[PDB]
Amino acid sequence: MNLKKYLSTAPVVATLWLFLTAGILIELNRFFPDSLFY
Amino acid sequence: YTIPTIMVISNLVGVAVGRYALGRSDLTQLIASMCFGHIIGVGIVLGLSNMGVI
Amino acid sequence: GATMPSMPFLKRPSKLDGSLPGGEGCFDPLGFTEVFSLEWLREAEIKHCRVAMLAVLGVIAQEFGTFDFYNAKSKLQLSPDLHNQFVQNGALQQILLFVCAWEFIVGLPALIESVNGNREPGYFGFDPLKLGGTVGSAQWKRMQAGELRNGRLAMIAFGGFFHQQLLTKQGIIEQLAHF
Amino acid sequence: VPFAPVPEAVRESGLAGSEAEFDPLMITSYLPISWMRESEVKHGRIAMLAFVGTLAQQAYQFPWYKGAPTTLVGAHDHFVTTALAQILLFTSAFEIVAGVPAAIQTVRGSGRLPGYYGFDPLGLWGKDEASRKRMELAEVKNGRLAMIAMLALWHQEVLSGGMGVIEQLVKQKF
Amino acid sequence: DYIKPYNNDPFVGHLATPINSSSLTRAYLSQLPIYRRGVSPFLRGLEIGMAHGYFLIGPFVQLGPLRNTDIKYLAGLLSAIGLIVILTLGMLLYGAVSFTNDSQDLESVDGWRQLASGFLLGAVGGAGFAYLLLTL
Amino acid sequence: EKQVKVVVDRDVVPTSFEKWAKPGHFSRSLAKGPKTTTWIWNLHADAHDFDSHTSSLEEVSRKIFSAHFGQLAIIFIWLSGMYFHGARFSNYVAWLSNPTGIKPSAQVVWPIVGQQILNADVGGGMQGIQITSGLFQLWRASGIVNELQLYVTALGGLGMAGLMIFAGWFHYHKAAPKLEWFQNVESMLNHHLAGLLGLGSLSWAGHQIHVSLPINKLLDAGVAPSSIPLPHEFILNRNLMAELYPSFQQGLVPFFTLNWKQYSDILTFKGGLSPVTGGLWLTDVAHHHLAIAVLFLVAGHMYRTNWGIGHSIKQILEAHKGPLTGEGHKGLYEILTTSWHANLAINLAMLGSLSIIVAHHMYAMPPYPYLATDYPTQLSLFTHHMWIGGFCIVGAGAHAAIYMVRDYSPTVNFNNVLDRMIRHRDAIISHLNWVCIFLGMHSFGLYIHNDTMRALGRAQDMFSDTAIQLQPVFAQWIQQIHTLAPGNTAVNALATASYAFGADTVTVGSKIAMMPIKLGTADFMVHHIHAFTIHVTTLILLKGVLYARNSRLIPDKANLGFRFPCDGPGRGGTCQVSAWDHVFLGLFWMYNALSIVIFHFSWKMQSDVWGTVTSNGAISHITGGNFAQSAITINGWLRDFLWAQASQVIQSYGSSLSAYGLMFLGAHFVWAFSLMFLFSGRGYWQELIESIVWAHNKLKVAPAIAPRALSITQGRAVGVAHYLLGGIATTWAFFLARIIAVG
Numbered sequence A: 001m002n003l004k005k006y007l008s009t010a011p012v013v014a015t016l017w018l019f020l021t022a023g024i025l026i027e028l029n030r031f032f033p034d035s036l037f038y
Numbered sequence B: 001y002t003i004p005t006i007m008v009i010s011n012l013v014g015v016a017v018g019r020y021a022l023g024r025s026d027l028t029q030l031i032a033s034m035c036f037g038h039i040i041g042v043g044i045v046l047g048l049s050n051m052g053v054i
Numbered sequence C: 001g002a003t004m005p006s007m008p009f010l011k012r013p014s015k016l017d018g019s020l021p022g023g024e025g026c027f028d029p030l031g032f033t034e035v036f037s038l039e040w041l042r043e044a045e046i047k048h049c050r051v052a053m054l055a056v057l058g059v060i061a062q063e064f065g066t067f068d069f070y071n072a073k074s075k076l077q078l079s080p081d082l083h084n085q086f087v088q089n090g091a092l093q094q095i096l097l098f099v100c101a102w103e104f105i106v107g108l109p110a111l112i113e114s115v116n117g118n119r120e121p122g123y124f125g126f127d128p129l130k131l132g133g134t135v136g137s138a139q140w141k142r143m144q145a146g147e148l149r150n151g152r153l154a155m156i157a158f159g160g161f162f163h164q165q166l167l168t169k170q171g172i173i174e175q176l177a178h179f
Numbered sequence D: 001v002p003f004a005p006v007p008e009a010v011r012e013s014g015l016a017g018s019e020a021e022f023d024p025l026m027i028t029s030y031l032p033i034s035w036m037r038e039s040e041v042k043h044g045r046i047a048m049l050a051f052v053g054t055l056a057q058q059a060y061q062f063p064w065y066k067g068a069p070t071t072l073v074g075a076h077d078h079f080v081t082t083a084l085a086q087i088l089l090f091t092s093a094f095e096i097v098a099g100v101p102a103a104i105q106t107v108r109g110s111g112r113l114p115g116y117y118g119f120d121p122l123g124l125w126g127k128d129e130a131s132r133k134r135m136e137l138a139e140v141k142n143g144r145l146a147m148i149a150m151l152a153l154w155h156q157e158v159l160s161g162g163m164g165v166i167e168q169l170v171k172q173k174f
Numbered sequence E: 001d002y003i004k005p006y007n008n009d010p011f012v013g014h015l016a017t018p019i020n021s022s023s024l025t026r027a028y029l030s031q032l033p034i035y036r037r038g039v040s041p042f043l044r045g046l047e048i049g050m051a052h053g054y055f056l057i058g059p060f061v062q063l064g065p066l067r068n069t070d071i072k073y074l075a076g077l078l079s080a081i082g083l084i085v086i087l088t089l090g091m092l093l094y095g096a097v098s099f100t101n102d103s104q105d106l107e108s109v110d111g112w113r114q115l116a117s118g119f120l121l122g123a124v125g126g127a128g129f130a131y132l133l134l135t136l
Numbered sequence F: 001e002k003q004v005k006v007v008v009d010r011d012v013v014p015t016s017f018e019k020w021a022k023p024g025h026f027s028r029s030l031a032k033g034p035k036t037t038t039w040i041w042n043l044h045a046d047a048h049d050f051d052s053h054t055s056s057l058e059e060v061s062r063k064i065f066s067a068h069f070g071q072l073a074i075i076f077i078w079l080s081g082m083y084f085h086g087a088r089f090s091n092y093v094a095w096l097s098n099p100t101g102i103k104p105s106a107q108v109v110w111p112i113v114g115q116q117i118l119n120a121d122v123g124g125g126m127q128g129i130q131i132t133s134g135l136f137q138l139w140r141a142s143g144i145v146n147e148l149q150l151y152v153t154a155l156g157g158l159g160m161a162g163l164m165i166f167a168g169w170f171h172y173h174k175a176a177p178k179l180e181w182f183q184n185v186e187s188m189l190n191h192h193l194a195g196l197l198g199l200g201s202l203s204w205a206g207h208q209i210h211v212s213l214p215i216n217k218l219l220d221a222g223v224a225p226s227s228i229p230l231p232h233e234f235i236l237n238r239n240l241m242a243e244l245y246p247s248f249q250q251g252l253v254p255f256f257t258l259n260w261k262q263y264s265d266i267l268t269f270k271g272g273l274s275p276v277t278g279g280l281w282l283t284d285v286a287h288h289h290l291a292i293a294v295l296f297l298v299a300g301h302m303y304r305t306n307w308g309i310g311h312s313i314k315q316i317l318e319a320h321k322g323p324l325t326g327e328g329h330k331g332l333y334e335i336l337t338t339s340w341h342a343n344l345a346i347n348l349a350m351l352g353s354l355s356i357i358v359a360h361h362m363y364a365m366p367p368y369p370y371l372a373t374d375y376p377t378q379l380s381l382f383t384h385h386m387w388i389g390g391f392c393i394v395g396a397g398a399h400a401a402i403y404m405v406r407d408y409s410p411t412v413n414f415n416n417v418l419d420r421m422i423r424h425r426d427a428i429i430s431h432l433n434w435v436c437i438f439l440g441m442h443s444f445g446l447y448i449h450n451d452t453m454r455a456l457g458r459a460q461d462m463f464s465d466t467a468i469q470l471q472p473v474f475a476q477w478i479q480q481i482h483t484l485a486p487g488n489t490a491v492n493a494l495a496t497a498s499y500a501f502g503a504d505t506v507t508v509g510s511k512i513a514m515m516p517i518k519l520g521t522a523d524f525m526v527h528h529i530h531a532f533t534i535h536v537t538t539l540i541l542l543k544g545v546l547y548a549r550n551s552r553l554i555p556d557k558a559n560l561g562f563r564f565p566c567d568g569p570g571r572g573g574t575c576q577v578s579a580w581d582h583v584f585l586g587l588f589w590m591y592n593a594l595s596i597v598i599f600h601f602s603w604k605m606q607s608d609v610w611g612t613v614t615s616n617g618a619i620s621h622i623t624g625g626n627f628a629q630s631a632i633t634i635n636g637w638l639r640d641f642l643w644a645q646a647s648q649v650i651q652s653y654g655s656s657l658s659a660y661g662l663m664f665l666g667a668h669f670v671w672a673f674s675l676m677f678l679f680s681g682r683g684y685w686q687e688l689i690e691s692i693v694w695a696h697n698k699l700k701v702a703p704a705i706a707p708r709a710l711s712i713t714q715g716r717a718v719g720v721a722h723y724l725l726g727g728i729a730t731t732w733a734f735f736l737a738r739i740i741a742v743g
């Protein structure tokens, strides 16, 4: 019953990391919309 | 009392055909023959009624 | 007649459960422990018992005093209007914040530990006043059974409180005093 | 061979429940005897309760429900909304918790006597095994007389234009 | 049981099925201008052509571009004759490359040349006869 | 006699996460470590292939029963999602108040990157994306009037999904049936015929009689949805049902007395569409469900199971034998009881055919209310079921080939229909190929000829109504017979089954619901095109299944397997010779056939059926009679259909339909990206990957998992997947945008 190892596999870790990245991007886009030319 | 008479006749016909086909007399054959007789009697009665005979 | 083994039902074959604190009833007519872990179910039952006891006493206590600084436009404590207004004013939002914090930071580790076979279900080691005595001895198993029974009664009484209030549009004390 | 001459030995003679072997259709030969016996005892208990309830409700009504029809059909239709609905809810709960699994286990090999529960508060079952056997045979014997009785009462009420059992026994017979 | 190997010898790439081989089928396939015993290549070609041009004229006269004009039959006949000439050209080419010098038995250069000549003559005559029938 | 008994193994498989941390554990080769990037693809390619994992049929049967439960749970979660979306983010009540004016919508887009524009002004207060799934019409037909019922249904669906999750886990780790179970085809068929379908239709008929009928009757009578009594009230208070339907006054007595004719108020056979909503009469639908339930129940007592009465499928199969078929159907029973691939092939072909039939029957005889007036929903549903049916058919062929390559046995298939077919497979495929050539010439050549004639100004020499005419006399005749059936062959039917055959037109909300679909020369040519494409795709699939084991080119294709790249550059070239490749080609052909089929339905419906009706009966279609003379030429199909109707999907920018336009472009990209994988080989990509790997090596950043190019078979699969995705998405966006912008 090694759930940590499974959660550490490539698909799970990749989906979690990309989900966090997309969430950060979206959150930044609603708090700071239509960002251009810094 | 035409419908009950037709249903009883259909049940007897079903019993005869069931005994012949299955070749045995038991509760299983009895219920199966009764089901067949009912499926034949219900249809005959409804068909005759649709024709105005009964 | 009956089968070779018996259950308090007097007509059932004893399940895997034997004699646990407050579990002498072996009340498992529908197979729930045969497929699901016993520790998981025990943890859930104790958590339900505790939250329900607080809810029953809370419903009765809320009908006497509202602190005077909370609007409380509705005198029915188990009504959706009161729940929504307290959620909007932030009181229930803060209860949710801290209760979720406890469940994630501590509740989840506690359940994982009890599911692995290390922590007894519903044992948080909270004994400020030595009321239960030593763990796993006299005054503890009996007290644990008492907690389980009081919690089950509180759960059934909370269901009754909610249904009665929603059907009579009257409080518990108000309904007890009139019809 | 059996109590009925035309049918053959219906089996189920070495089991418990009734010395007489009345199973002309040999339904037991194609169904579990324990399950059928459990259904039979359940029918008997329900029918006996219904018979007493029919002879009681038609004679006296509780202060509550003051205005309510006494006929089985009328009473059912008038109470199928709140009273009988609640009765059904609780009886169904009892069957769901203790009813269905009991029969399931009995059929799956449990040694439970069909129709057995631990409901013997006054200890009227008896001490001697013979007394217990006679008592069970009496419960089933008294039953099957209440099932037929309930069917007869319902038919008489329907054919008598909603007439009570005693009322019909005192006014007319046809 | 009706389906059997063509020559009663398995491992052959053919099957003796009902319409494939039958009393009626064997009789019909046989006796045709081709496959009939005692028929010179020219006679086979003449029969085949007179039977081909006859039905070949139909399509051109009935659905030709000039099917609505007063020369629909003549235009269709000319088109059929041209198609017949092209087919004869193909036949002669096939005989020129496929067959070599040997006895005239329909499988030689001379045999296929006679067959082609007969086919051309028969096709032209059949087309003309059909055109005459249509005009009359 | 065999006892139809249940035997199971307890705690056969332990429940633990130990195997979750070892990808490829199910395969002996995949459990030794990747060593290359191809292992990642092989892990997913052979994940659901339970027959390759173990050689035991019992284990495969258990792995299928479970995972079937998982898919059932997935379907229940999806259904719960649809119901919750309807209850929380949809204008269902507003739509009920004004079904014709309010556009169905159950999706609300979050305002984040300007995507809030997608919230179309569908009406009813809320603004969102218009749904063309027919969820609103279905819910209305089911009697739903308030969102509380939708919420309860969503909760019930979630509970059912949880049950299907528990059942799947329990039937693999707590109680796994043995191979004797799953081989009781007689019992499985009896139960599925009388319990899954028979009792299911019976229960639905009861629900319609007690819920759909009264609620819909009140809705169609001008009663507000909030004022209609609750469904339970119609059951408790029989007075209401009696008032709405006097037949209920008699109760169930007429049923038991065979006086079924007394149920003429609820069990009608009107035959036509309701003039108020445009759909089938709910009474006819309830009567139909009752009849189908009784018929299925009677059919469910045919096979023999644990009793003397019944039939044996093996005996019936072996009994059918003739002179032209030596052993008839002998050995087929053992084939369908020892190989899940054969059963899957038959079931997939039938399920796909059933879906296609469903599409046709649903558009012609709109069953749900206000379904015909909602052209977007009609187009989407016909096209959707048409596509799912075609995909299931291609899958059926693929699984037939799989069984032929792996589960085939010469002893079992000896002198039977299957063996006799494999014997003359050359006659089958050459004659079928000849039919395909003839169909293509006489179908596409007619179109090409018309193009050539119109371009030359010789319109008098075309295959049209004015010029040479090709009228579907047989189909037109069947239509006339259907038009006259309600009075000479359907005595009790009061109207034609479908108004598409004839009779009169039906208009609801100033919109045409269903009018006679007249067939002409254009329909003759398009129908022949459909037949031609179906013949070529079935030829490809049949060829792949018949030669799956061997052929004159490769004498031992079976030993090579069902899914192998090729035998090499020998014998002139043996590329795409395996059956899997035949399925790969059949996918493109099925896509072509289905695309042409949906194109015909869309254009014909928009030019001769769908449209508006002005007062006094004047009819004006979306594309007024242009299909009669424009669908007879490829130029017309490109100008009047692909170019004229695309203006809505290309000009959708700046509005709520902009998303569709975006998807219209994206799909194209995908369809063009597939070409990359279809016109290329892995040798070149492997060399390019070698150079890239050298670049990585120069920086000490090379990966342990040696990068490799996609396998030949994997490359073909990726190419076909992208091709189908792009094409179907392009036609999806085009259809949805065109039908939503207008009509």
Ligand code: CLA
Pocket: D073, D158, F202, F203, F205, F206, F207, F209, F234, F235, F236, F237, F238, F241, F247, F248, F249, F250, F251, F252, F253, F255, F263, F266, F267, F290
């Ligand atoms: C699986 C599908 C299904 C299901 C689950 C149900 C379920 C139900 N149906 Mg139903 N029904 C169905 C399909 C289904 N139906 C079909 C296909 C039809 C034919 C179209 C009907 C037609 C139908 C009718 C007409 C009625 C129901 C009714 C009912 C409800 C009570 C049935 C009952 O026991 O009353 C029993 C009624 C009887 C009359 C019993 C018959 C024998 C009695 C004992 C006669 C003896 C005389 C006695 C004094 C009673 C006088 C009755 C007389 C005045 C009518 C019940 C919830 C009833 C209802 O509750 O309405 C809302 C109702 O009247 N159904």
Ligand code: CLA
Pocket: A019, A020, A021, A022, A023, A024, A027
């Ligand atoms: C994964 C990356 C990510 C990140 C970095 C953030 C960051 C932030 N979110 Mg956010 N969020 C995310 C994902 C993320 N979110 C997702 C996937 C959802 C669901 C679509 C939400 C929904 C959400 C809401 C509704 C709100 C925020 C808010 C906020 C800000 C509040 C301050 C804070 O520190 O809380 C940190 C928060 C996180 C790190 C994410 C936790 C999200 C949890 C699951 C709460 C959402 C509950 C949801 C309504 C119901 C169940 C969801 C289910 C997944 C369990 C903040 C900086 C609040 C805000 O607007 O500030 C004014 C607010 O109202 N988020």
Ligand code: CLA
Pocket: B039, B040, B041, B043, B044, B047, B048, B050, B051, F295, F492
């Ligand atoms: C021996 C006495 C008797 C009499 C006098 C009648 C008289 C009648 N019956 Mg009837 N019937 C009887 C016995 C009798 N039946 C019995 C014993 C049964 C049980 C087997 C039935 C079952 C039965 C049914 C199911 C039906 C009738 C119907 C009818 C009426 C019209 C049938 C007709 O002639 O149209 C002639 C019809 C045709 C020539 C068309 C043939 C059927 C088409 C082509 C459908 C083909 C279906 C498909 C290809 C095959 C099945 C597929 C499978 C998946 C289901 C008619 C008044 C019909 C009815 O309901 O009346 C309104 C009807 O549907 N009967």
Ligand code: CLA
Pocket: E056, E059, E060, E063, E064, E065, E066, F441, F442, F443, F444, F445, F446, F448, F449, F452, F461, F462
């Ligand atoms: C494959 C589809 C197709 C079809 C059905 C037609 C059909 C036709 N075209 Mg057309 N055409 C086509 C494709 C097609 N074309 C294409 C693709 C082009 C562009 C290159 C053209 C360009 C074109 C032009 C320029 C013209 C036509 C014309 C015509 C008409 C007369 C042609 C003619 O005389 O041929 C002759 C046909 C035959 C000699 C024999 C046909 C085969 C026979 C009937 C088969 C019998 C088999 C039999 C049943 C087997 C069993 C028998 C055995 C057992 C005994 C005709 C209706 C002309 C016209 O004016 O249009 C009306 C014309 O000028 N076409």
Ligand code: CLA
Pocket: F064, F065, F068, F069, F072, F182, F184, F185, F187, F188, F191, F192, F194, F195, F196
């Ligand atoms: C009348 C009894 C009955 C019924 C109603 C069903 C119904 C079903 N069976 Mg099933 N089956 C039965 C008896 C029955 N079976 C018997 C006796 C055997 C052994 C011979 C099998 C062996 C069998 C196999 C091997 C498979 C099925 C599968 C399925 C499902 C097909 C998928 C589908 O169409 O989605 C429709 C889904 C629904 C309409 C939802 C309804 C679901 C509920 C729970 C009804 C099913 C009741 C269930 C059969 C018995 C309850 C057991 C109890 C202890 C809880 C479907 C739900 C397939 C499947 O999907 O696997 C899970 C499949 O692989 N059956």
Ligand code: CLA
Pocket: F044, F045, F046, F047, F048, F049, F050, F348, F391, F392, F393, F394, F395, F396, F398, F402, F562, F563, F580, F583, F721, F725
């Ligand atoms: C009930 C339907 C059904 C079922 C149960 C099966 C079951 C099976 N199939 Mg089959 N098949 C089906 C339908 C079905 N198929 C259909 C409809 C087709 C035609 C498309 C096929 C064509 C097919 C082929 C050619 C093959 C199989 C194979 C197999 C077996 C292994 C599957 C596997 O492990 O691959 C793993 C599955 C994947 C890696 C997923 C691939 C994803 C594709 C591209 C679909 C993407 C859909 C999605 C909507 C895309 C948009 C979203 C995107 C942007 C992310 C397995 C027993 C294989 C086999 O037998 O092994 C030798 C085999 O080669 N199937």
Ligand code: CLA
Pocket: F669, F670, F671, F672, F673, F674, F675, F676, F677, F678, F679, F680, F684, F688
């Ligand atoms: C739409 C058609 C299409 C597209 C888009 C491409 C694109 C590409 N080709 Mg190409 N090709 C095509 C058709 C196409 N080809 C055809 C028909 C042939 C003839 C067989 C070729 C033959 C060919 C050869 C021989 C070669 C290429 C090469 C390349 C790559 C060049 C480098 C580059 O620009 O990288 C930039 C990347 C892109 C342009 C792709 C866009 C980025 C994507 C969309 C982002 C990732 C996915 C995104 C997250 C969304 C998906 C999410 C998921 C959940 C579904 C590039 C990816 C060369 C190469 O390998 O370059 C090194 C190479 O040598 N192609």
Ligand SMILES: CCCCCCCCCCCCCCCC(=O)OC[C@H](COP(=O)(O)OC[C@@H](O)CO)OC(=O)CCCCCCCCCCCCCCC
Pocket: F320, F321, F322, F323, F324, F325, F328, F329
């Ligand atoms: C001729 C009258 C039928 C009209 C044609 C359309 C019929 C539809 C059924 C399709 C099969 C064709 C019927 C003959 C077939 C038929 O039923 O023959 C009879 C025979 C079945 O009789 P048996 O004695 O073998 O019966 C024992 C077994 O059937 C046990 O059930 O079938 C064959 O063995 C040959 C199978 C195909 C033979 C090759 C023909 C392929 C051509 C396919 C195209 C058909 C025409 C297309 C439409 C124009």
Ligand SMILES: CC1=C(/C=C/C(C)=C\C=C\C(C)=C\C=C\C=C(C)\C=C/C=C(C)/C=C/C2=C(C)CCCC2(C)C)C(C)(C)CCC1
Pocket: E050, E051, E052, E054, E055, E121, E122, E123, E124, E125, E126, E128, E129
């Ligand atoms: C598929 C089909 C069919 C068909 C049939 C047929 C086709 C028949 C016939 C026929 C034909 C197709 C015929 C033709 C013909 C021709 C003729 C009869 C002619 C003639 C004569 C003459 C007059 C000649 C002349 C000449 C000259 C002028 C010179 C040179 C040489 C010659 C000799 C050529 C059948 C019905 C079976 C079946 C169904 C359908």
Ligand SMILES: CC(C)[C@H](C)/C=C/[C@H](C)[C@H]1CC[C@@H]2C3=CC=C4C[C@@H](O)CC[C@]4(C)[C@@H]3CC[C@@]21C
Pocket: C030, C031, C032, C034, C035, F010
């Ligand atoms: C989810 C509830 C509502 C239902 C009743 C659960 C029933 C569980 C699965 C249990 C209860 C009694 C049955 C039970 C009896 C005895 C056991 C022993 C134990 O090794 C588990 C299996 C096993 C052999 C089975 C599993 C299946 C049953 C039916």
